[PDB]
Each structure stands twice: as structure tokens, then as C-alpha cells.
RNA sequence: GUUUAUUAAAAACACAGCACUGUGCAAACACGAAAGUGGACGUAUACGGUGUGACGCCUGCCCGGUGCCGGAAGGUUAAUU
């Protein structure tokens, strides 16, 4: 399939490139999000004129994921209280909803899928490192505590 | 009421915790309306095989007099706590209060 | 019933032929598939058992092309 | 418990039975029951797709709580009850806010014991705990496969798995067949083994007490007439083929599990 | 106990018991172009298939043939190219 890219996808291409991806991965993910979109005449002359749109929105979006990740550097630290039993283990464990909600508690909001914890879903308590993101580029971190109830 | 002679080994990445266990046992006991004769928190020390692909363990000696339930109950914790990897009930004949040899030789 | 969505694609017959031409009779199937198709014009995914065939199709003329033609014959989705 | 039977009759020579004295004597718990009433083996077309099954004793459904899933509260066992669904007994439970469940009776329970079920619940026979919670070793029954489904796993009466192995989001168990499989460790299990375990040794006795669990006599292939059964035919007594099914494949050896999509679940086949 | 309604009631069939084998649950299997349904609101002390036929004492040797299970290094081998 013969797509043109509107934003810059992994190792295809740049905002405008005439790239032959398969069609699986056009019709699945790249046309479903807002990717991509094929190269049909009046796509391809559409996005020539809407080049610049594109490139503003491009940045205006690049320029709030930078301030977000600024806001979650300034927090740099969230509690969350959940029930341990003895030796710091926790019963349950702390979720990425738990540490969604706990982010939008300290300051304004975050989504679920945002989160990028990298060894498992906090099964112990102490001091643990979360990651964070907002666009493909930025990757802010959180020290995130946990205590007992 | 009995005499007896406990000793544990605390995987050394929970050392940390040893306090705590400690205090907890005590007032385990002591609830029980038991005495503690001696308390040696040995520390960490080098073992003579691997036990679990461990080199080191924490060792804590002690010397309690308590009811034979509470004792059950405190060997039940002993297996159901992962922390600890191996302990030793030992009845004994009398209170003994006076020093171990591996706080007595420093 | 095995139909596809977008070509209209059936079930048809013909014969089972052996080495020593014996005849028996037989279908051919469409190769169908259930599958969700996104729509840009209506934020919203669509479900169609559509033949590959059809997602060829699909894939040359366009989704929302495809809805109106389906629109066209009646064919609710 | 197990007890023989005097011979004073020839269907009463062989009769072994099992007496539970502790088992209530009177009615069950009316709002857990259910009608269910008999099939016959035969499904919503009328035929028989399971042979051999027809006829028994009427019986009641009682609703027994398999998922285990009233958390953090305790409940009392009030009394242990007969099923005639299943081949363990059953206990009926009173929360402590009094609401009443049946569960499955584990070995070493009784009225007066204490049972919870949570992620904090103490490890003894009757509590129920996500496998992360139980320890490895431990004999368990009752078990999920999918982490909220209800308990699929060692239900039958004696019947118990063993928690070989943890290997991050999942355990190993062995299984009363012999094999080895993966299961999710935020799945549910109930520590102890299934009570009732003297079940297996009863003896019927008589054909009429096979009757009266609702099944029917098996007539041998090779009694059978050639149009009936493939092992049919001869003059007098002849064989002469490959023991099959009625419906011709081979049954004595030939495998037939054919799922790829559990394949992965699956450590060790039984042996 | 059951059977050839209408020339055969028996030593035939069934039976409790025994064994082998399949089956980890969306189970095997069965009815069904399918959806589904029985198995089963059961979960290997369970269910299906097969042979034997209370019980007592027992059940020896042969895996060359046919089947089944397991192996997979080679040899041969389809569509495709
Ligand atoms: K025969
Ligand atoms: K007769
Ligand atoms: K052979
Ligand atoms: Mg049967
Ligand atoms: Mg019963
Ligand atoms: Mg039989
Ligand atoms: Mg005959
Ligand atoms: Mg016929
Ligand atoms: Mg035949
Ligand atoms: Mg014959
Ligand atoms: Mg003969
Ligand atoms: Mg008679
Ligand atoms: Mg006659
Ligand atoms: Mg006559
Ligand atoms: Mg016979
Ligand atoms: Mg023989
Ligand atoms: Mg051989
Ligand atoms: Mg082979």
C-alpha cells in the first residue's frame, strides 16, 4: 500500500513521504490513528496545501508534551497508601489507574496509558521509579512512594 | 511453661527488617505473659554451604521461656515468613542468661 | 448467510472431479472474515464480514465509497 | 464410615456404603435451591448424543459458591450437607453479615469452623487466596483458570493440586490426572483438599443403584448385529478387528486431543 | 432382571465388580453445512469408549505379522517457484 505519513512514524518517513508500507499495517494501525493517510489524488493534493497546518500542529502538540513533561519533573514525587502486610509486602499491588489517579491528585490531569513502568505493577513497598510520556520523544520520570494504610 | 532456644537466619537483603522482627517476637511472647532471658542479634556472617544460592545470612540467638502454643504459633510464622530461611527450637533444661561465645569472643 | 458485505460473494457449486472422473458434488466458499473498519467521516468502526476480496476493494476505493454503495443497495451494518 | 453389608440378600451381599454422621439430617437451605430437571443425554434436537444416561432419582440444585468472592468478611460453617449433584458434600456458611452460602466442603472442616477468602486471609483449609498469596507447595482445590471465572480445577470428592512452581505471572501445578500446567497466579484457589474422600469406596452392589444415579445399561459392541456396531456380527463368539468406537475410531490407545490454543498452557502431558 | 408384539425366554442380553484406553474444560465424544445443544450448571474419587462379567484361587510365554504410542538422523515425497 502506497501511504503518505502525516506525522513522523518510527523508521518509515517524515510529515510527507510517498512510503510503500504492507496493508495490514496500513489499514490497522497507521490509517486508524492519525498517522497516515493513502495516497489517493485529492489526498496527495489535499495534504500539499494542508502542509503547513500540519507542520504548525505538529509543533503546537510537540511544545505541550514538553510543558507536561516539565510539570511531571517539577512533581518528581507522588505517595500512594495501599495495605502491606508485614515485611513490606503488599497483598494487592499499586495499578497504573492507581498511579494515574494518584498523578491527576497532585496536579492536573493524565491519562491511563501515558505510564511506562518497566519492571512489573509495584508488588513491594519503597522508593520506585516510573516513567512517563506524552509524545513519542519525551520520556519524564517520577519517583512514586508507596507506604502502608 | 518451658525454656527454649530459638534461633533464625534472615535472607541479608531483609536485614533491614530484623528490628522489626524482633520487637514483634518479643511482644509475642511477652503478650503471653512470657520473658525474654537473652536477645543476640548476630548480624550478617558468612555461611559454611549455600543455603537458597546464598553466602551470607543474618543470625538472630534467643533465649525465651513461654507456653508451648505461643511457641507453635512463632514456628508458624517462622514457616510462613520468607524472609527467614532456616530456624532451630531448642528446649532447654533452664533459663540461661549469660553470653553466647560469638558475642563473647569481641 | 456466508455472504460477503461488499461484492456480494456466495457460496457456489461444482463438482469434486477424481483421477478417474468421477463427479460429486461440492461448494465453494467465499473466504469470509468479520472485520472492524474505521471511519474518519463518523469517529466510529464499523463491522462487515466481507470477503478478502472485499478488503481489497475496500482498500482501492475507500471506506466511506464502499458505506455509500452499501447504503445504495439497502444492506443495513 | 465404610460399612458392609450383612448378606440377607443377594443384592445385599456385596453392598458397601459410606455413612457421614455429621451431614444434616433434615431439609437444605430453600433460597439456594434450584430445579433442574433430567436430559435424558439427549440435546435440543432430541437425540441422544451421550448414551446410557437416563432415568434416577428427581433431584435439587443447589447453588454452591465457587467463585469465592465475598473478601475481607468471615463466615462460620453452620452445617455440612449432602449433594446429590456432585460427588463431595457441601457446607452451608453464614457471613457476619448474614448473608448464607454453600462451598464446597474441604477435609478437615466442621460447624464451628471460621473460613475467609482475600488477598490478607490466613493460609488454613478453607480460605481462599490468589495463587500469588498461596505459598509453593502448598495442596490446594477448587481452582481458577481465568482470575475471576469461579473455581474449575479439583472439585471432585479427594480430590486436590499441588503448587509446584511460580515463575512470574504464573504457577505451575500438578493436577490429580498427573500433569503439569500453567495457570494465571492471580487466580483463586481454597487451601486444604476436598473432603468426602472415602467416596471411592463404595461398593453398589446391584445394578438397581446404577439406576437409581440415572444410567443406563451398556450393551457390548460385539453383541451387536453388523449395521449396529463395526465390532458386530459373527457365529457365536468372533472379534477379529481392531477394538473401535461405535462411530469407528480406535479406542484402545489412540490419542484425541486436538486444541493449539492451549497447547501453551500444557508443561507435561500425563503418563 | 431383559429379549425375538405374532412358532425360540435360553446357556442369549444386562448386571454389580475388574481392567485397558481417551479426556485439563471452549474436555474427549455426539447431534448439527452453521449458530448452537447434549456431555454438565459436572471438572480426573469426573466423563466417554472398549473388553470381561458376583465371589474365591489365579491370569504363564511371544512385539515376527496387523494396529496403536513414541522418535526423527537419513532416504523418498504434494501444491508452490
Ligand atoms: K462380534
Ligand atoms: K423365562
Ligand atoms: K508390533
Ligand atoms: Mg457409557
Ligand atoms: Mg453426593
Ligand atoms: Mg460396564
Ligand atoms: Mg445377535
Ligand atoms: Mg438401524
Ligand atoms: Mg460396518
Ligand atoms: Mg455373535
Ligand atoms: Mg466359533
Ligand atoms: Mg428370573
Ligand atoms: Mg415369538
Ligand atoms: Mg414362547
Ligand atoms: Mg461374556
Ligand atoms: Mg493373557
Ligand atoms: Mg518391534
Ligand atoms: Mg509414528
Same mark, same amino acid.
Given at each position: 500500500?502506497?501511504?503518505?505519513?502525516?506525522?513522523?512514524?518510527?523508521? &518509515?518517513?517524515?510529515?510527507?513521504?510517498?512510503?510503500?508500507?504492507? /496493508?495490514?499495517?496500513?489499514?490497522?494501525?497507521?490509517?486508524? =490513528?492519525?498517522? /497516515?493517510?493513502?495516497?489517493?489524488?485529492?489526498?496527495?493534493?489535499?495534504?500539499?496545501?494542508?502542509?503547513?497546518?500540519?507542520?504548525?500542529?505538529?509543533?503546537?502538540?510537540?511544545?505541550?508534551?514538553?510543558?507536561?513533561?516539565?510539570?511531571?519533573?517539577? &512533581?518528581?514525587?507522588?505517595?500512594?497508601?495501599?495495605?502491606?502486610?508485614?515485611?513490606?509486602?503488599?497483598?494487592?499491588?499499586?495499578?497504573?489507574? #492507581?498511579?494515574?489517579?494518584?498523578?491527576?491528585?497532585?496536579?492536573?490531569?493524565?491519562?491511563?496509558?501515558?505510564?511506562?513502568?518497566?519492571?512489573?505493577?509495584?508488588?513491594?513497598?519503597?522508593?520506585?521509579?516510573?516513567?512517563?510520556?506524552?509524545?513519542?520523544?519525551?520520556?519524564?520520570?517520577?519517583?512514586?512512594?508507596?507506604?502502608?494504610? | 511453661?518451658?525454656?527454649?532456644?530459638?534461633?533464625? $537466619? @534472615?535472607?541479608?537483603? =531483609?536485614?533491614?527488617?530484623?528490628?522489626?522482627?524482633?520487637?514483634?517476637?518479643?511482644?509475642?511472647?511477652?503478650?503471653?505473659?512470657?520473658?525474654?532471658?537473652?536477645?543476640?542479634?548476630?548480624? !550478617?556472617?558468612?555461611?559454611?554451604?549455600?543455603?537458597?544460592?546464598?553466602?551470607?545470612?543474618?543470625?538472630?540467638?534467643?533465649?525465651?521461656?513461654?507456653?508451648?502454643?505461643?511457641?507453635?504459633?512463632?514456628?508458624?510464622?517462622?514457616?510462613?515468613?520468607?524472609?527467614?530461611?532456616?530456624?532451630?527450637?531448642?528446649?532447654?533444661?533452664?533459663?540461661?542468661?549469660?553470653?553466647?561465645?560469638?558475642? +563473647?569472643?569481641? | 448467510?456466508?455472504?460477503?458485505?461488499?461484492?456480494?460473494?456466495?457460496?457456489?457449486?461444482?463438482?469434486? %472431479?477424481?483421477?478417474?472422473?468421477?463427479?460429486?458434488? !461440492?461448494?465453494?466458499?467465499?473466504?469470509?472474515?468479520?472485520?472492524?473498519?474505521?471511519?474518519?467521516?463518523?469517529?466510529?468502526?464499523?463491522?462487515?464480514?466481507?470477503?478478502?476480496?472485499? $478488503?481489497?476493494?475496500? #482498500?482501492?476505493?475507500?471506506?466511506?465509497? @464502499?458505506?455509500?454503495?452499501?447504503?445504495?443497495?439497502?444492506?443495513?451494518? | 464410615?465404610?460399612?458392609?453389608?450383612?448378606?440377607?440378600?443377594?443384592?445385599?451381599?456385596?453392598?458397601?456404603?459410606?455413612?457421614?454422621?455429621?451431614?444434616?439430617?433434615?431439609?437444605?437451605?430453600?433460597?439456594?435451591?434450584?430445579?433442574?430437571? +433430567?436430559?435424558?443425554?439427549?440435546?435440543?434436537?432430541?437425540?441422544?448424543?451421550?448414551?446410557?444416561?437416563?432415568?434416577?432419582?428427581?433431584?435439587?440444585?443447589?447453588?454452591?459458591?465457587?467463585?469465592?468472592?465475598?473478601?475481607?468478611?468471615?463466615? @462460620?460453617?453452620?452445617?455440612?450437607?449432602?449433594?446429590?449433584?456432585?460427588? /463431595?458434600?457441601?457446607?452451608?456458611?453464614?457471613?457476619?453479615?448474614?448473608? %448464607?452460602?454453600?462451598?464446597?466442603?474441604?477435609?478437615?472442616?466442621?460447624?464451628? #469452623?471460621?473460613?475467609?477468602?482475600?488477598?490478607?486471609?490466613?493460609?488454613?483449609?478453607?480460605?481462599?487466596?490468589? $495463587?500469588?498469596?498461596?505459598?509453593?507447595?502448598?495442596?490446594?482445590?477448587?481452582?481458577?483458570?481465568?482470575?475471576?471465572?469461579?473455581? =474449575?480445577? /479439583?472439585?471432585?470428592?479427594?480430590?486436590? @493440586?499441588?503448587?509446584?512452581?511460580?515463575?512470574?505471572?504464573?504457577?505451575?501445578?500438578?493436577?490429580?490426572?498427573?500433569?503439569?500446567?500453567?495457570?494465571?497466579?492471580?487466580?483463586?484457589?481454597?487451601?486444604?483438599?476436598?473432603?468426602?474422600?472415602?467416596?471411592?469406596? !463404595?461398593?453398589?452392589?446391584?445394578?438397581?443403584?446404577?439406576?437409581?444415579?440415572?444410567?443406563?445399561?451398556?450393551?457390548?459392541?460385539?453383541?451387536?448385529?453388523?449395521?449396529?456396531?463395526?465390532?458386530?456380527?459373527?457365529?457365536?463368539?468372533?472379534?477379529?478387528?481392531?477394538?473401535?468406537?461405535?462411530?469407528?475410531? =480406535?479406542?484402545?490407545?489412540?490419542?484425541?486431543?486436538?486444541?493449539?490454543?492451549?497447547?501453551?498452557?500444557?508443561?507435561?502431558?500425563?503418563?
Amino acid at each position: 500500500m502506497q501511504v503518505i505519513l502525516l506525522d513522523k512514524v518510527a523508521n &518509515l518517513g517524515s510529515l510527507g513521504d510517498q512510503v510503500n508500507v504492507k /496493508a495490514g499495517y496500513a489499514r490497522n494501525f497507521l490509517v486508524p =490513528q492519525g498517522k /497516515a493517510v493513502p495516497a489517493t489524488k485529492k489526498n496527495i493534493e489535499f495534504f500539499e496545501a494542508r502542509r503547513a497546518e500540519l507542520e504548525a500542529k505538529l509543533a503546537e502538540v510537540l511544545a505541550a508534551a514538553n510543558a507536561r513533561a516539565e510539570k511531571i519533573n517539577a &512533581l518528581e514525587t507522588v505517595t500512594i497508601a495501599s495495605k502491606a502486610g508485614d515485611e513490606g509486602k503488599l497483598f494487592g499491588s499499586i495499578g497504573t489507574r #492507581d498511579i494515574a489517579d494518584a498523578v491527576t491528585a497532585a496536579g492536573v490531569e493524565v491519562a491511563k496509558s501515558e505510564v511506562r513502568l518497566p519492571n512489573g505493577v509495584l508488588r513491594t513497598t519503597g522508593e520506585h521509579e516510573v516513567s512517563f510520556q506524552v509524545h513519542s520523544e519525551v520520556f519524564a520520570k517520577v519517583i512514586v512512594n508507596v507506604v502502608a494504610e | 511453661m518451658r525454656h527454649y532456644e530459638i534461633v533464625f $537466619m @534472615v535472607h541479608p537483603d =531483609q536485614s533491614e527488617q530484623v528490628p522489626g522482627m524482633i520487637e514483634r517476637y518479643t511482644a509475642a511472647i511477652t503478650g503471653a505473659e512470657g520473658k525474654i532471658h537473652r536477645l543476640e542479634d548476630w548480624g !550478617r556472617r558468612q555461611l559454611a554451604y549455600p543455603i537458597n544460592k546464598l553466602h551470607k545470612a543474618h543470625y538472630v540467638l534467643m533465649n525465651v521461656e513461654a507456653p508451648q502454643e505461643v511457641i507453635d504459633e512463632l514456628e508458624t510464622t517462622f514457616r510462613f515468613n520468607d524472609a527467614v530461611i532456616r530456624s532451630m527450637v531448642m528446649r532447654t533444661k533452664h533459663a540461661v542468661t549469660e553470653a553466647s561465645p560469638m558475642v +563473647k569472643a569481641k | 448467510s456466508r455472504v460477503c458485505q461488499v461484492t456480494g460473494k456466495r457460496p457456489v457449486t461444482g463438482n469434486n %472431479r477424481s483421477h478417474a472422473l468421477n463427479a460429486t458434488k !461440492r461448494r465453494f466458499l467465499p473466504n469470509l472474515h468479520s472485520h472492524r473498519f474505521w471511519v474518519e467521516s463518523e469517529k466510529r468502526f464499523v463491522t462487515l464480514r466481507v470477503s478478502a476480496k472485499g $478488503m481489497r476493494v475496500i #482498500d482501492k476505493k475507500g471506506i466511506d465509497t @464502499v458505506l455509500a454503495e452499501l447504503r445504495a443497495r439497502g444492506e443495513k451494518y | 464410615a465404610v460399612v458392609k453389608c450383612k448378606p440377607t440378600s443377594p443384592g445385599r451381599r456385596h453392598v458397601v456404603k459410606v455413612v457421614n454422621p455429621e451431614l444434616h439430617k433434615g431439609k437444605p437451605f430453600a433460597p439456594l435451591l434450584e430445579k433442574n430437571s +433430567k436430559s435424558g443425554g439427549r440435546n435440543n434436537n432430541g437425540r441422544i448424543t451421550t448414551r446410557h444416561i437416563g432415568g434416577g432419582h428427581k433431584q435439587a440444585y443447589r447453588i454452591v459458591d465457587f467463585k469465592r468472592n465475598k473478601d475481607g468478611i468471615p463466615a @462460620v460453617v453452620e452445617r455440612l450437607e449432602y449433594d446429590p449433584n456432585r460427588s /463431595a458434600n457441601i457446607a452451608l456458611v453464614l457471613y457476619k453479615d448474614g448473608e %448464607r452460602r454453600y462451598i464446597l466442603a474441604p477435609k478437615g472442616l466442621k460447624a464451628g #469452623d471460621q473460613i475467609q477468602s482475600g488477598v490478607d486471609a490466613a493460609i488454613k483449609p478453607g480460605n481462599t487466596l490468589p $495463587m500469588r498469596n498461596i505459598p509453593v507447595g502448598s495442596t490446594v482445590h477448587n481452582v481458577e483458570m481465568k482470575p475471576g471465572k469461579g473455581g =474449575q480445577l /479439583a472439585r471432585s470428592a479427594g480430590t486436590y @493440586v499441588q503448587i509446584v512452581a511460580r515463575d512470574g505471572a504464573y504457577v505451575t501445578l500438578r493436577l490429580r490426572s498427573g500433569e503439569m500446567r500453567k495457570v494465571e497466579a492471580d487466580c483463586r484457589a481454597t487451601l486444604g483438599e476436598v473432603g468426602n474422600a472415602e467416596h471411592m469406596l !463404595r461398593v453398589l452392589g446391584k445394578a438397581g443403584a446404577a439406576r437409581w444415579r440415572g444410567v443406563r445399561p451398556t450393551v457390548r459392541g460385539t453383541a451387536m448385529n453388523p449395521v449396529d456396531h463395526p465390532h458386530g456380527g459373527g457365529e457365536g463368539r468372533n472379534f477379529g478387528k481392531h477394538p473401535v468406537t461405535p462411530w469407528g475410531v =480406535q479406542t484402545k490407545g489412540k490419542k484425541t486431543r486436538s486444541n493449539k490454543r492451549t497447547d501453551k498452557f500444557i508443561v507435561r502431558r500425563r503418563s
